[PDB]
Amino acid sequence: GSFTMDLVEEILRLKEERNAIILAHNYQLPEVQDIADFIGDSLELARRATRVDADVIVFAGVDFMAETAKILNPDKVVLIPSREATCAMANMLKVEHILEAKRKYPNAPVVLYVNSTAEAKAYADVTVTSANAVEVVKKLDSDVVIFGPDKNLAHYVAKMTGKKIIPVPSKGHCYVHQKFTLDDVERAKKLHPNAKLMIHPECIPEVQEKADIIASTGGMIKRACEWDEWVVFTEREMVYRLRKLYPQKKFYPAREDAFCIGMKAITLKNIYESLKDMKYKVEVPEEIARKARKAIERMLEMSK
């Protein structure tokens, strides 16, 4: 025929030529999810980064996720397709906040959400995601923990563990999940009265309290078998992921306008350019990476 390769076919060829794997988060654009080799939540992506056979990881996700992959694979090439694929919440936490909390509470473990810089993780005893924060905090040998950046996840963890949570920084939150309100709950239950509500713990507490399930995006997928219709209180591309996994169920976005700008910095074109030009190489200074790795490895040890 007269036709050549499209972007998809160019990516498939370059993935072979580079001996690469494409890891994608659940919030990636559908056409990006459709070319990824592995799709998952933050915890699943971290765990998958410990069994990489490929030489090159193309990370279709935000900065903190790609850096976590690099911390776990210091001697592989990790590429982020855009350096503007960033998490607003992760960048709210600075080392100075951690040091001030550690001064007040020297015996409190420092528990950092994976939404954090590698520099911040160098001061963590253990990392967590929304999938394992409760389990990890419950197991830590202290009735008080320093925890951040997300104050809404912190609220959920405090409620479920009964432990005292010292927030770092004071007001960390995700603007995407803050778009969900009680009015969205009322509208969803009116429009879809037979649906159950799956709600991310980055949503505000009063919205969390309306959930049928509170879960990470990975837990939403794991627990979707519990009902046939769901309203999805997280970033709207999760609806595509759930529909692909369970075509027989019904999924509805809680808000179509719940979009993560950083996630959508990743495009098919820049994934192609990432493989073609071997960019942008993610690097983490060795001293930071080794300390961060200790905290991430401990997380993986404490939650299977």
Ligand code: SF4
């Ligand atoms: S959805 Fe929110 S917390 Fe998750 S990557 Fe985007 S800004 Fe960060």
Ligand SMILES: [Cl-]
């Ligand atoms: Cl692999």
Ligand SMILES: [Cl-]
């Ligand atoms: Cl199924």
Ligand SMILES: [N+]
């Ligand atoms: N103890």
